[PDB]
Amino acid sequence: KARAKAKTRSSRAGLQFPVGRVHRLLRKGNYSERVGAGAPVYLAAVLEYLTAEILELAGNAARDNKKTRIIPRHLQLAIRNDEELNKLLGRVTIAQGGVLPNIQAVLL
Template sequence: MNHVGHIHRHLKSRTTSHRRVGTTAAVYSTAILKYLTAEGLELAGNASKDLKVKYEELDSLIKGTIAGGGVIPHIHKSLIGKKGQQKTNGCLDSVLSQDS
């Protein structure tokens, strides 16, 4: 999206008298652009939902990239504690046992 540094550099290059451009101006401008982009995307999404628009190409792209690119749901057996076993912090237990 829009980064504050990019916006700051753009604001500095567009000033006619080459005066100082504060960083708060860049932060504020970036926040405004981000808000307007989010509002525009939300309105477009609502309109397409209301009109029941279907995009087969977009559906196939999303299925191929998002659904196929996740994390495999597997937790190694050694990481799962046994029932009734209390969780302990290994570092703290070793320090406490050395002090005794």
């Protein structure tokens, strides 16, 4: 009955995103019969990396606007000003995001 105190699998992987919740969503999402132990760790790390990349670009875009809070416009500016992120979120509409200020050069 000498049961150790529970450590979350996010802390063993060094992550902020939940490894156990990603494991449950992989098991209940009808993806395969079996889910390996390292698959939710790898997936939670990839999701944490992508979230951190978008949030850092949006925080930089909010700081350039002299704002301290990220609004949907800052996420839209972070995503559409980056070719890889615009290619990843290609057919994605961000609500309240607006458009890029693109006026055609032949008009001026």
